[PDB]
Amino acid sequence: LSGAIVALILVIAGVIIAIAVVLFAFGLIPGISNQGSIQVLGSGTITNSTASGSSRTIYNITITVKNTGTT
Amino acid sequence: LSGAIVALILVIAGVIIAIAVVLFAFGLIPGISNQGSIQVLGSGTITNSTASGSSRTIYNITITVKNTGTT
Ligand SMILES: *[C@@H]1O[C@H](CO)[C@@H](O[C@@H]2O[C@H](CO[C@H]3O[C@H](CO)[C@@H](O)[C@H](O)[C@@H]3O)[C@@H](O)[C@H](O)[C@H]2NC(C)=O)[C@H](O)[C@H]1NC(C)=O
Numbered sequence: 001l002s003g004a005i006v007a008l009i010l011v012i013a014g015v016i017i018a019i020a021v022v023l024f025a026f027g028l029i030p031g032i033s034n035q036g037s038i039q040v041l042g043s044g045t046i047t048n049s050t051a052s053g054s055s056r057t058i059y060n061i062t063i064t065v066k067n068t069g070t071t
Numbered sequence: 072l073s074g075a076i077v078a079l080i081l082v083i084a085g086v087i088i089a090i091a092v093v094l095f096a097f098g099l100i101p102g103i104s105n106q107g108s109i110q111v112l113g114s115g116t117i118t119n120s121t122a123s124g125s126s127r128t129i130y131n132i133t134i135t136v137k138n139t140g141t142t
């Protein structure tokens with residue numbers, strides 16, 4: 001008897017997990033868009049910004065950035 | 072005589088208890104085999120709900136959900 005009862009449980013669970021995985025594949029798609037939100041416009045500048053005789057060299061990066069995203 | 076009447080009682084009782092276990096196996100089927108599920112549709116969102124420098128961070132989660140079951 002046991003084998004048929006087990007197969008029935010695993011059939012129905014198979015349908016449920018397969019549908020959930022298909023829905024997840026459709027559900028990913030909106031996240032892909034955000035990978036393109038930024039673009040950098042023109043040349044930026046680097047400037048030596050550290051104080052005289054300081055242990056660390058520290059530069060200053062100025063760039064135009066454009067954010068086309070919603071965040 | 073005795074051995075044959077006892078063999079017959081155990082044949083009859085065997086039929087009875089075997090059929091009882093077969094009917095029980097058919098009686099399991101509805102409980103183990105409910106089809107349909109919570110389906111999650113598209114992307115959801117997480118939003119910071121935390122306010123006023125509270126000790127525990129709380130997040131809103133909003134998502135579209137479809138119950139295809141009967142409960
Ligand atoms: C950013 O500015 C610093 C000063 O504000 C400067 O430190 C001085 O460095 C000079 C000599 O610079 C040469 O040698 C160093 C190594 O010692 C190189 O890293 C550098 O590229 C040059 O070839 C030194 O005489 C002086 O005492 C330092 N301090 C001051 C107050 O002048 C950094 O060198 C400078 N970095 C860059 C990349 O320009």
Ligand SMILES: *[C@@H]1O[C@H](CO)[C@@H](O[C@@H]2O[C@H](CO[C@H]3O[C@H](CO)[C@@H](O)[C@H](O)[C@@H]3O)[C@@H](O)[C@H](O)[C@H]2NC(C)=O)[C@H](O)[C@H]1NC(C)=O
Pocket residue numbers: 118119120131
């Ligand atoms: C997460 O969902 C909550 C409902 O489950 C929701 O509560 C409702 O809040 C609105 C007003 O929310 C505004 O103001 C809060 C600050 O108080 C902001 O965090 C929020 O972004 C909105 O600008 C209220 O009218 C309504 O009655 C509340 N309903 C319930 C059931 O509590 C939260 O606002 C929501 N959180 C965020 C961050 O959206």
